[PDB]
Each structure stands twice: as C-alpha cells, then as structure tokens.
Amino acid sequence: AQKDEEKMEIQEIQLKEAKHIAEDADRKYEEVARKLVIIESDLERAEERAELSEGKCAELEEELKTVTNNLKSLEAQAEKYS
Amino acid sequence: AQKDEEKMEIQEIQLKEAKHIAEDADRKYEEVARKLVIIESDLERAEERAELSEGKCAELEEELKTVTNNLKSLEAQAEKYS
Amino acid sequence: DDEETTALVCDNGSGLVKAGFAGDDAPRAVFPSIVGRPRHQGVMVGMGQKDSYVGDEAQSKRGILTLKYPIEHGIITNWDDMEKIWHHTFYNELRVAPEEHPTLLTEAPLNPKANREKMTQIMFETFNVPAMYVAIQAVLSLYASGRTTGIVLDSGDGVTHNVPIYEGYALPHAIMRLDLAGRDLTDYLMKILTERGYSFVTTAEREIVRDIKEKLCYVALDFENEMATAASSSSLEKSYELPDGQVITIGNERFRCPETLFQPSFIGMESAGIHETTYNSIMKCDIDIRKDLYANNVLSGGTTMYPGIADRMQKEITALAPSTMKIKIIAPPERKYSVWIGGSILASLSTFQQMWISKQEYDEAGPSIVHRKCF
Amino acid sequence: DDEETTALVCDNGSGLVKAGFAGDDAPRAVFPSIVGRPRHQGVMVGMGQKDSYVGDEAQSKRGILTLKYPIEHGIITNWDDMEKIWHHTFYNELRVAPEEHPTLLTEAPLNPKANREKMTQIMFETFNVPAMYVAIQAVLSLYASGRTTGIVLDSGDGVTHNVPIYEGYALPHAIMRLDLAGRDLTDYLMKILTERGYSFVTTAEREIVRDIKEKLCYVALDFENEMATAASSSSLEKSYELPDGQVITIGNERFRCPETLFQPSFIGMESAGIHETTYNSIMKCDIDIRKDLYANNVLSGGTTMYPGIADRMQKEITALAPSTMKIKIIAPPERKYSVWIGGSILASLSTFQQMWISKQEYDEAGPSIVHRKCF
Amino acid sequence: ISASRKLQLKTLMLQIAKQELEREAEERRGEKGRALSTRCQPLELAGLSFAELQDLCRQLHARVDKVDEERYDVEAKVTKNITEIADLNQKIFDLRGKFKRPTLRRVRISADAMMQALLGARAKETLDLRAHL
Amino acid sequence: GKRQTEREKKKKILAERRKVLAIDHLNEDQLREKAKELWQSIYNLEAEKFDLQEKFKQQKYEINVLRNRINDNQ
Amino acid sequence: DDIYKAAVEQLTEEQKNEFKAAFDIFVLGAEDGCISTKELGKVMRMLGQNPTPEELQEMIDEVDEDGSGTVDFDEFLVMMVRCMKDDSKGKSEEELSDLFRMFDKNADGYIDLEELKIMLQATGETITEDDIEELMKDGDKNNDGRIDYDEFLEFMKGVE
C-alpha cells in the first residue's frame, strides 16, 4: 500500500503537468487559427483585385487595337484622296 | 491498498488522455503551419502579378490617348478633303 | 447647376434604357431593360430575396432568374414591367423625383397609337411629371449629326426604321419600317451555333450569345468570297471563353450572323435587306432631293456598330444607285448614343421650350392630346 | 429578449446523435446512437440489470451486448428503438422536458416521405412538443460556413449527399445522393484486415474497427505511388493496441480503407467517387453559376475528417474541371459539428421564428403537414 | 511611419474632429433656437376688444391648422424617406450577406467548460456498484 | 400612388390634428390666456417643423452617401 | 506624456499594486531590487496572457537595443500597458458615419488627399512630406484614386 501511494502521488503530479501542457496547446491552437483566418481573407482580396486589373487590361488592349486599325485605314484613304 | 490502486488506475487513464491530447495538438498545428506557408507564398505571388497588370494597363491608357489624338487629326484631314 | 429646371431625356429603346439630364454629352445611366422573377424555390431564410430584379442587377443574378424584356418590337407588350423599369430608372439610377422634371421619351415611327397614349397616361398619372413630349427616334439621330437633311437608318435592337428628311421637312410617305433588328440576329446566331455542338436554350444564355455576337461578329465586304475563304483556310476561327471555361471556336458563323441584315431571307423574312430598303426609301422621295439624300446617308442605332458595315452598305448602294451620284455614309463613332445625344440637344433648345405637353392641357383633353398639335 | 423560450436543436444523424440548446457553439451531448439488449443469461440476482442500454452506456458494457443501430442509411428502420433513443436524449442527456421546447430535427435529402411523417407524428404525439421543424442536412452546413452560395458535400456516416445552392436558391434537380459513407468504410476495413490475420466478427468488434479507422487511416494524395511505397519500405506500418493487448500493425490498409470514397468499385458499388459526383452535380447547374460553385466547394460531415482529403479532392476536381476556373475547398476545423452549428444559427434567427409547424396546424391537417408550405 | 505614431496622429485627428463637431452641434442648436424664435412674430394682445382678439385667435387657429397640413406633407415626405433609408440599409445587408451568414449569433456558451463531470459520474456509478455488492 | 388613399389618411390625421373649441364663452383675460397658449402651441409647431426639416436634410445626405457607396461595388 | 499618463491610468494604481505583487513574484528576489531585464520575459512565461511578438519587438527596439541587461520602471510599464486589454473597440459605426461625413466636406462620397491633409493639419500635428506620402503608403490602403468608404471603415478597426 505504501508503494502504491508513492505511485499515486507521482501520477498525480504528472497529471497536473499534463493539464498544463493541454492548456498551452489549446492557446497555441486558437492563436494559429486567428492567423490563418486573417491571411486567407487577405488572399481573397488579393485574388479579386488581380482579376479586376486583368480584366481592365484586356478591355483597354482591345479598344487600342480597334482604334489603331481604323486610324490606319483612314490614313490609307487620306493618301488615296491626295 | 485497494483504494490506492484504484486511484492509480484512474491516474493512468488520465495520463493516457493527456498524451493523446498532445499528439492531436501537434498534428493539427503542423497542418496549419503548412497551410499558413502555402497561403503566404501564393498571396505574395498574386500581389506581384496584379501590380504588373496594373502597370501594363496604365501604359495601355497612354497608348490609347495617343491613338485617339491621331485619329482626330486624320478625321479633320479627311473632312477638309471632302 | 442650381436654380432653374433641367429636363430628363429618357429613351426607352428596346434592349438598353439610356437616360440622363439634358445638356450633357453621354447618358448618365445605361442598363439593360429586363425584369426577371426568380424561378427556383429558395431555402435560405432572411436572405432578403426580392420578387423582381430589374435593370443591371438582373444581369448579375441571371443564373437563377428568367429574364424577359418588356418591349418586343418597339411596342410595349407588358405595361406593369415597363412601369417598374421606369420607376427604377427615375429613382435609383438618377435619384431625381419626377415631380420636378420634364421628360422627353422617344418612340419608333409607325407604332400603334395605344402604346403612345398609354405611355403619356402613365407618365402623367403615376409618376406625375410636369410635362412630357414624345419624339420620333430618327429626327433626334439627325440632330446629333449636326445636319438638317439626310436619310437616317436607325437600326436599333427592336426595329429598324429609315426616315428620310430634307431641309427639316420630313417625308411621311417615305418611311420604311422593317422589324429585323439586333434581337433577331441574336436568335439567328444562337440557332446557327448549334451546327458546331454548342446549344444555348435558357433565356439567360441568350445574354451569352449576345455577348458573343457583340465581341466577335463582323460584316463581310463580299459574302461569297468570305464563305469560300473560311471553308479553306482557318485564319478566321476566333475563340471565346464562356462564363465557366470550355472555350468555343466560331468559324464562318462570324460573318453569317450579321449578313442577315442584307439578306433577310436567312431568317425567313420576305423583305429586302437594309441595303435595298434605303434605296427604295430614297426613290419614293421627289426627283430633286435625291442627290442630297444620296450624299448624306446617316447611320445610327446600336446594331450598325458591326466592324465593316459602313463599307458594305456603301458598296451595295453604289451598285444600286446611278453611277454619277456620290454616295457617302456618315458613321460617327458615337453611334450607339446618337439618339440620346440628339435628344439632349433638342431638349436644350430655347425654341423648343414651348412644345411640351403641359399637364393642364392633358387634364383638358385626355391622353389623346399626344396625337394633336403637340405631337 | 424576454419571454419565450429556447429551442432544442436535435440532429438524429446516423452513428452519433448531436443535440443541444439553440444559440451555443457546440452540441451539449454527443453519444453514439446504438441500443443493445443483453444476449447472455445472467446469474447474479438483484444486480439491477436493465433490458436495453442506449447511448453511451452501451459503449461501456458492449462486451455482453448486441449493439444495433436504429438508422441504416438516413432512413429509420426500427421505430421503437429510435423512440427510445429520442426519449433518452431528451430526459437524461439534456434533462429538459419536451413539453416546453421547440425542436428542429434534420433529415437527409431524397428520403422516403413516410420516414419524415412518422418522425413528426412521434414528436407531436409521444413527446408532445410545442412545435417542430425538419430541415435538410446540407443547408445547415452551408449556414455554419457563413456563406450563401456553394456546393456542400456532406459525407456523414449513413449517406453522402451533395446539395448545390446559389444565392439562397437551392437547385432541386442537381442533388446527387450516394449511399456510400462511413459505415461502409468500416465494413470494408474490417474485411481487408483479414488479410493479415485479424478477424473481427462480433457487432461489438465493429466498434473497435471503427476506432482503428478513426485513429490510423488517412487519404493518400496519389494512390499508385502510395501502393508502391508501402510495398517496398516499412515507414507506414503504424501499430495499435487492442482493448486487451496484442498490438496489431496496419500496413497499406491505412490508405486503402478511405480510398473507397474515390473508387466505389472496391466495395462493388457501380457509381463514381465523391470526386466525380461533385463535378457531375456542378455540371447539371446552369452555365453562369458554375464559377461560384467551383470557388466555394464546402466539405462537411464526419467522414470528411480524414487527414489529407481536402488536397486529394482538390487535385481530382482540378483535373476534371476546366483549367481556367479556380478550385477552392472549404474545410473548416469544426467539420464534424458543422451541421449542428448551422442548425443552432438557423434556430436562433428572428426571421425563422414563424416557420415552425405549430401544433394546432398539425391537429388540422394531420402528419402530412410537413410536405406542405411549412416544409 | 511606425504604427504607434501613426495611430497617435489618427487619434488626435479623430479627437479634433469630435470636438469641432460638438462645437458645431451646440452652435446648430443655438442657431436653431434663434431661428425658431425669429420665425413667429411675437404676440402683443394688450388692450384689445372682443372683435379684434376673437378674429386674431380665429386666424391663429386657421393658420395652426394650415401648419398641421404643412407638417403632414413634410412628415409624409420624411416617412417615405425613412422607408427608403430602411431599404438602403437592407440592400447593404444583402450586399454584405454573401459571407455574413454565420456572423449574427452567439457561440462558446456553456458546454466548453464542463468536462470533469462525466468522470465524476463514471466514478460514482462504479463506486455505487462496488458498494452495493 | 393612389392619392385617394393619401387624401383619406390625411382626413383621418387632420381629425387627429383637429383641436376646435367654443369661441364666444370666455372673458377678456381668459381670451388673452388662450391666445398666449395658442402662441406657445404654434411656437412648438414651428420648432417641430424646423427639426423635421433638418432631419430630412440628414436623411437626404445619408441616402446620397449610401446610394453612392452601394453603387461603388461596380 | 498625456497619452503616457492616460496609459498609466489604464493600468491604474490598483492594477499597479496587483502587478507590483506579480512583479515581486517574477523578480529574482532576495537581492537589492536592482531590477534586471529577463523578468519582462518571465511575466510572459508566467501571466498566461503572453506578450505578443510585436510587443517583444517593440521592447527590443526601446530596451536591450543597447543590450541594457535591465528594464526601467518606465520601460517596464511601457511593455506592460501593451499587454493588458486597454482596447477602445474602434469606436462605433454611427460615430464613423458622423466623422466621415464631416471629413467629406465636398460630399464626394469619399475622402480626398486634400481633405485628409487639411484635417490632419487642422489637428495641429506636423503633417509634412513624411506624412500624406507615407499615409498614401500606410493610411491610404486601397490607393485607387482616393480613400473610399470601406477603406477608412476598416482602416480604423479597433483603434482610437
């Protein structure tokens, strides 16, 4: 019975240490979750703004093409009327 | 002595549960570490490429302005020709 | 701005409602005229789901709506939806109460009377405007060009009409109104796309086919040569990315869709193309103003924005017309909003300020006032 | 707040009953749904031996019981046992009499009507609740993610169903319900463990195999490479201690058990995996909402907790889908209780407070009221 | 430049804005009282006959009812404005509701703290079984 | 917008707003006291109308701002 | 100092005495009270509400950047005030509406660089090229022509 009491108290201090380790891990978990949420939100915004920029670039490119071609044709016609 | 032994068994199961907590915490934390790093790298790249597109779009704006002015000139010439 | 009172130049159109205050260069708010009720059931509670999304809002939720245009061919077939569109236009896109602003609607030529009378009755009873005036959509397009003569071909999205005008005197016996327009071209394009495997059926996918038509189609200078070239080489096949991926490749459907304008036999219509109804409209005019009409042919309306139409039409008319006359086709770059720019100019005139249909006049003669002197 | 009371958000499920009051973060009491009669004779007198241990009590005396789940595949096959489970849940795990609390059950899509009608009849006659409402298990999981669109794959333990939703409008023609779930994976694992010598037969040892599956199995990113690696090295063999000693070593059974999800041909099922029924469910939707569904794919349910599934599924869908669309898989850490969290949120809404099936309404129309407007 | 200094400058800006806004609020209230006093011409009824005072009171009555009519018109306008204000609030709620579904709620209430009561229940049932035998 | 309904509601509200009494049953000082009370009442009416005017100003300002900010999405 | 003394009041004299008992707990003890350096890390290891790495780097920038081997009472409280939650919730949506309506003097639907400059100079702080330009880099997050509504709505989250 004496030996068993010894083992009981040893396991008792071990259990307290275990609980503390558990709480520390819990706090770390909450922290990392917060960080991940923030960074993902930033990812959303970054992707969306990238898309906006790409679309606008496309539209401006097309308009440039059209106007340039019209100008070239009218230049040819100016020579013709000369 | 029997009561003490029962106490010991209880402590044993609790220690088991604590180690279980430790392992699951570590696993989830490593997972979130992976996700964090991947998200961060991709966010960096996305911001870079979006800014590149923005610069190209501004250049396109200037090009379009040049073309518009030249078309105005050619149109005036053609109408006077008429 | 400040004191004083500005006029609202609305322009119902059929496909795009264009509105804005009188005296500017471009319409303030341009948005499709579609009203789409949701068609599925809806399970989320408290999402704030409305019963009808109108205007440009229903072009973003079109995946779960059934869009339906309230104006078929110039005429208005569904008055409640048109009233909803007008209410949206006044209150949300311009944010000006109609109780303090004259309005200048536009109407196609040769339209049913009841349509115009109902339009004025709505504007005077529901929205309660101070004074409204209805103008023919072609005279405005002639205003915008800064001319005073010329024969204007206003190929909108609902109906294509061809009003000749000389020295400010319109010729009512020479108006040739044809009901082929952009919508029929959209339907024909959607029908010939099925020859490659792409099937668009839903009323929402009609918008996708419209976008394809706007971005890719062009009018061929010579039809047979293009048909022969597209059947041998592959320099014409332009690809386009659907709203979900799966790019498509349009071959000789590119110039076959807008060719329907010059050969209305493609969609089974009997009449002659827009290249020959203009010549017929000219030949009905007197023998002494045909040279001026030949030299001042004006294009307007959205559907005349196809790349390469101002050359095909000139070639066709030069083939038809006598060899001595000079054929010139005025195609301003601001073609789409030409009618609205002309409307703004007309509403900004001082001489026009006493032609409005004042409300007391409507109270004395009823809605039939529009056919009277105040035209 | 004030008068009034709190709602009971029960969630029958199949394998774990999750319940708790509305407005919290996690269910109050979670316990397996098994009812096990004793099977041996019993010689001690006065031991106080009951005739049926339900819930978590029968997971401790499982050595001398014959556990049998009352819910096979979503549907309920043994109504007396289900009534016993509900009675236990109300009175002993929550200790709140049902006479003073509304209830919000959950039901899989495409289930037999008679099941739902019997459920409401029981809740109104035996337990005599004030008002109960039945909701589809996927809409709640979409609530919990805080989205309003997205296609949710809720791979429970009984049945895996895949409900796409856009802007709050569910698409009833695109629900793909597949009956492979956690229970079939447990049976297949128990069947492939016999290839090393370990034989589990008793209905009590199915629980041990379930624990092995939960603690050891994982989904392989690439199946053939893992099969080749596990056949050469020995870095995968993880050991596990049975409830009596005699540790066992699981080799390539680790990633072969949950691979059945992506290749249902392993257990002889014809259909395609959960990686291809999602793509098929998307392709049945309209062409304009496919991008949003691609970007907001949601995972839920217990069985989607395997380590490494959110990457395998994304790789598979990216292989199937067009190259331009972005594929994103939402896998919240609180996956298991996602349906119940969503249920709590829905029950806590003010807009939802008038959708309950009040008892007087049931008295007037009978149990068939559930199929009516109060869905 | 550094975050702390920038936040201090922003706080100073907000405080200056708040103080100038409170100053303008008291100015507006005082000016509003002054204008309200200015609007009505003061009443001086000293030495008035029955006819004069009665006609004055009757005209004041009629003008008060006219003011009631005017306030009815203005308050109908304001009620329509309130309706469109609520509509705009609802529209912003709808535009933000794409991701705001799980936002309006309360979580982590009661079940997070209670963990060791189950162990006590198990110990109690085992002890009861052992003590009864 | 069915101004008949608005006119009916106006008649009901004017009934709510109706404060009409006797006119020839008082003495001179009582008449003066009633006139003073009526002056105070119309002063309150003026104050409430000015409050409504500024409230409507703020309503219109916030409506413009909210309209612009919702339009800024596209 | 006014902000500094307000922060001192935040961890008030009662809180000062409680954290003084805590400080005696995590001091070396049984010595002259010279006050060393690592005890501000000891309070991180002890309090549970561990100072953030941002707090650690702010302390490093102020203290031990000379390798000081000790922390003053003033630097100690500078570290301590940044740990306890003296938050201001970032005001309220109505107060944001009022403030940003005031800042939108031109009623453009946004706040311009000119309005921001005149407002920040109207507070008396030296607003030079160090500001505005950095505020373009820092205060203006969107940098899409102006400072739009959500830009300054979220830009002032949890701040004073």
On whether the CB atoms of residues C190 and C200 are closer than 8 A, the answer is: yes
| Test the G interface: residue of F54, F69, F71 with most G CBs within 10 Å | F69
Q: Do chains B and F touch (3 or more CB pairs under 8 A)?
A: no
Q: Strand C29-31 and strand C17-19: pairing?
A: antiparallel
Query: Distance (Å, rounded) from C-alpha C281 to C-alpha C273?
Result: 12
Q: Taking phi first (over 0 means left), then psi (-120 to 50 degrees means alpha), and beta for anything else, what does residue C35 get?
A: beta
Q: How far is D39 from chain C (nearest CA, A)?
A: 47
Query: Distance (Å, rounded) from C-alpha A36 to C-alpha A44?
Result: 12
Contacts 24+ apart (CB under 8 A), C344-352: C344/C9, C344/C20, C344/C22, C344/C23, C344/C24, C344/C25, C345/C140, C345/C143, C345/C144, C346/C104, C346/C135, C346/C139, C346/C140, C346/C143, C347/C7, C347/C9, C347/C22, C347/C23, C347/C102, C347/C104, C348/C7, C348/C22, C348/C23
Burial label, C24 (beta-carbon count in 10 A; 0-12, 13-18, 19+): middle
Q: What are phi and psi of C267, to 5 degrees?
A: -100, 20
- Of C341, C343, C339, C316, the closest CA to residue C327 belongs to C316
Q: End-to-end alpha-carbon separation of chain F, Å? A: 32
Query: Distance (Å, rounded) from C-alpha B41 to C-alpha B49?
Result: 13
3-state secondary structure of D243: coil
Q: Do chains D and F touch (3 or more CB pairs under 8 A)?
A: no
Q: G62 a known binding residue?
A: no
Length of chain B: 82
Task: Write the DSSP symbol of residue E43.
Answer: P
Q: How far is E80 from chain D (nearest CA, A)?
A: 24
Give C92's contacts in chain F (Cβ within 8 Å). 67
Q: How far is C96 from chain E (nearest CA, A)?
A: 13
Q: G87 a known binding residue?
A: no
On whether the CB atoms of residues G11 and G84 are closer than 8 A, the answer is: yes
Q: Does E103 touch chain D (CB under 8 A)?
A: yes
Give D341's contacts in chain E (Cβ within 8 Å). 102, 107
Q: Which domain holds residue D102?
A: 8-141+337-364
Q: Do chains A and B touch (3 or more CB pairs under 8 A)?
A: yes
| Strand-by-strand arrangement of the C53-54 sheet | C53-54, C35-38, C65-68
When divided into structural domains, chain F yields a total of: 1
Q: Which domain holds residue E5?
A: 1-42
When divided into structural domains, chain E yields a total of: 2
C15 and C94 together in one domain: yes
Query: Distance (Å, rounded) from C-alpha C214 to C-alpha A62?
Result: 13
3-state secondary structure of D210: helix
* CB–CB contact E65 F32 (8 Å): no
Tokens of D238: 């993880």
Query: Distance (Å, rounded) from C-alpha D168 to C-alpha C55?
Result: 21
Length of chain D: 375
Nearest by CB to residue A29, choosing from B29, B36, B63, is B29
Q: Does A53 touch chain B (CB under 8 A)?
A: yes
Query: Distance (Å, rounded) from C-alpha C19 to C-alpha C35?
Result: 18
Q: Identify the H or E element spanning D238.
A: strand D238-242
Q: Does B50 touch chain A (CB under 8 A)?
A: yes
On whether the CB atoms of residues C252 and C236 are closer than 8 A, the answer is: yes
Count of CA atoms in the C-beta half-sphere (13 A) of E19: 8
C137 and C201 together in one domain: no
Query: Distance (Å, rounded) from C-alpha D249 to C-alpha D246?
Result: 10
D129 and D197 together in one domain: no
Q: Would F1 be classed as within a structural domain?
A: no
* CB–CB contact E16 G135 (8 Å): no
Q: Does G120 touch chain E (CB under 8 A)?
A: yes
> What is the radius of gyration, based on Cα positions, of chain F?
21
Burial label, D169 (beta-carbon count in 10 A; 0-12, 13-18, 19+): buried
* CB–CB contact D290 C208 (8 Å): no
E84 and E50 together in one domain: yes
Burial label, F7 (beta-carbon count in 10 A; 0-12, 13-18, 19+): exposed
Q: How far is E17 from chain G (nearest CA, A)?
A: 7
Q: How far is A8 from chain B (nearest CA, A)?
A: 5
Query: Distance (Å, rounded) from C-alpha F69 to C-alpha G146?
Result: 13
Tokens of D63: 């050595």
* CB–CB contact E57 F35 (8 Å): yes
- Of C366, C358, C371, C372, the closest CA to residue C116 belongs to C371
Tokens of G121: 């100079």
User: CB neighbours of C286 closer than 8 A, spacing ≥ 6?
Assistant: none
Nearest by CB to residue E101, choosing from D27, D146, D344, is D146
* CB–CB contact E78 F56 (8 Å): yes
Q: From residue F53, give the alpha-carbon distance in Å to each of C100, E74, E77, E88.
A: 19, 8, 10, 21
Q: Does F6 touch chain E (CB under 8 A)?
A: yes
* CB–CB contact E108 D147 (8 Å): no
Q: Identify the H or E element spanning D228.
A: helix D223-230
Nearest by CB to residue E14, choosing from G58, G135, G160, is G160
- Of D241, F74, D200, the closest CA to residue C56 belongs to F74
Count of CA atoms in the C-beta half-sphere (13 A) of A2: 0
E36 and E49 together in one domain: no
* CB–CB contact G123 E12 (8 Å): yes
CATH of the domain at C254: 3.90.640.10
Query: Distance (Å, rounded) from C-alpha C257 to C-alpha C191?
Result: 10
* CB–CB contact B28 D333 (8 Å): yes
Tokens of C18: 């264009």
* CB–CB contact D148 E105 (8 Å): no
Header resolution in angstroms: 6.0
User: CB neighbours of C111 closer than 8 A, spacing ≥ 6?
Assistant: C74, C75
* CB–CB contact D146 E108 (8 Å): no
On whether the CB atoms of residues C174 and C281 are closer than 8 A, the answer is: yes
Tally of CB atoms within 10 A around A58: 13
Query: Distance (Å, rounded) from C-alpha C340 to C-alpha C13?
Result: 10
Q: Strand D160-166 and strand D169-170: pairing?
A: antiparallel
Q: How many Cβ pairs closer than 8 A exist between chain C and F?
A: 5
* CB–CB contact F1 C95 (8 Å): no
- Of D149, D141, D144, D142, the closest CA to residue D167 belongs to D149
Residue whose entry in the numeric block shows the structure tokens 């236009």: C89
Class of domain G2-81: mainly alpha
DSSP string computed for E69-101: HHHHHHHHHHHHHHHHHHHHHHHHHHHHTTT-T
Query: Distance (Å, rounded) from C-alpha G11 to C-alpha G85?
Result: 10
Q: Does B29 touch chain A (CB under 8 A)?
A: yes
Q: What are phi and psi of G59, to 5 degrees?
A: -65, -45
Tokens of D247: 């540790």
> What is the radius of gyration, based on Cα positions, of chain C?
22
Domains G2-81 and G93-155 equal at CATH topology level = yes
Chain B touching partners, 3 or more CB pairs below 8 A: A, D
Query: Distance (Å, rounded) from C-alpha D122 to C-alpha D367?
Result: 10
Q: Would F37 be classed as within a structural domain?
A: yes
E55 and E86 together in one domain: yes
Nearest by CB to residue C95, choosing from F1, F67, F74, is F67
* CB–CB contact F48 E82 (8 Å): no
Please report, as a single letter, which amino acid is at residue C27: P
- In this structure, is the dihedral angle defined by the CA atoms of residues D261, D266, D269 and D275, taken in order, positive or negative? positive
Tokens of D185: 């994976």
Q: Does F60 touch chain C (CB under 8 A)?
A: no
Q: Strand D297-300 and strand D329-330: pairing?
A: parallel
Q: Does D308 touch chain B (CB under 8 A)?
A: no
Q: Would E125 be classed as within a structural domain?
A: no
Q: Would E3 be classed as within a structural domain?
A: yes
Q: Does C205 touch chain D (CB under 8 A)?
A: yes
Query: Distance (Å, rounded) from C-alpha C54 to C-alpha C67?
Result: 9
Q: Taking phi first (over 0 means left), then psi (-120 to 50 degrees means alpha), and beta for anything else, what does residue D62 get?
A: alpha
Q: Would E75 be classed as within a structural domain?
A: yes
E92 and E49 together in one domain: yes
Q: Identify the H or E element spanning D241.
A: strand D238-242
Cross-strand pairs, C133: C104
With helix as H, strand as E and coil as C, how does chain C read?
CCCCCCCECCECCCCCEEECECCCCCCCEEECCCEEEECCCCCCCCCCCCCCEEHHHHHCCHHHEEEECCECCCCECCHHHHHHHHHHHHHHHHCCCHHHCCEEEEECCCCCHHHHHHHHHHHHHCCCCCEEEEEEHHHHHHHHCCCCCEEEEEECCCCEEEEEEECCEECHHHCEEECCCHHHHHHHHHHHHHHCCCCCCCCCHHHHHHHHHHHHCCCCCCHHHHHHHHCCCCCCCEEEEECCEEEEEECCHHHHCHHHHCCCCCCCCCCCCHHHHHHHHHHCCCCCCHHHHHHCEEEECHHHHCCCHHHHHHHHHHHHCCCCCCCCEECCCCCCCHHHHHHHHHHCCCHHHHCCEEHHHHHHHCHHHCCCCCC
Tally of CB atoms within 10 A around C243: 18
With helix as H, strand as E and coil as C, how does D105-153 read?
EEECCCCCHHHHHHHHHHHHHCCCCCEEEEEEHHHHHHHHCCCCCEEEE
Q: D328 a known binding residue?
A: no
Give E118's contacts in chain D (Cβ within 8 Å). none
Cross-strand pairs, C53: C36
Q: D146 a known binding residue?
A: no
CATH of the domain at D87: 3.30.420.40
Query: Distance (Å, rounded) from C-alpha A28 to C-alpha A20?
Result: 13
CATH number of the domain at G93-155, out of 1.10.3720.10, 1.10.1200.10, 1.10.238.10, 3.40.190.10? Answer: 1.10.238.10
3-state secondary structure of D178: strand
DSSP string computed for D16-57: -EEE-BTTSSS-SEEE---EEEE-S----SSS---S-EEGGG
C-alpha C281: how far from chain center? 20
D29 and D136 together in one domain: yes
* CB–CB contact E112 D148 (8 Å): no
| Dihedral angle over CA of G132, G137, G142, G147, nearest 10 | -10
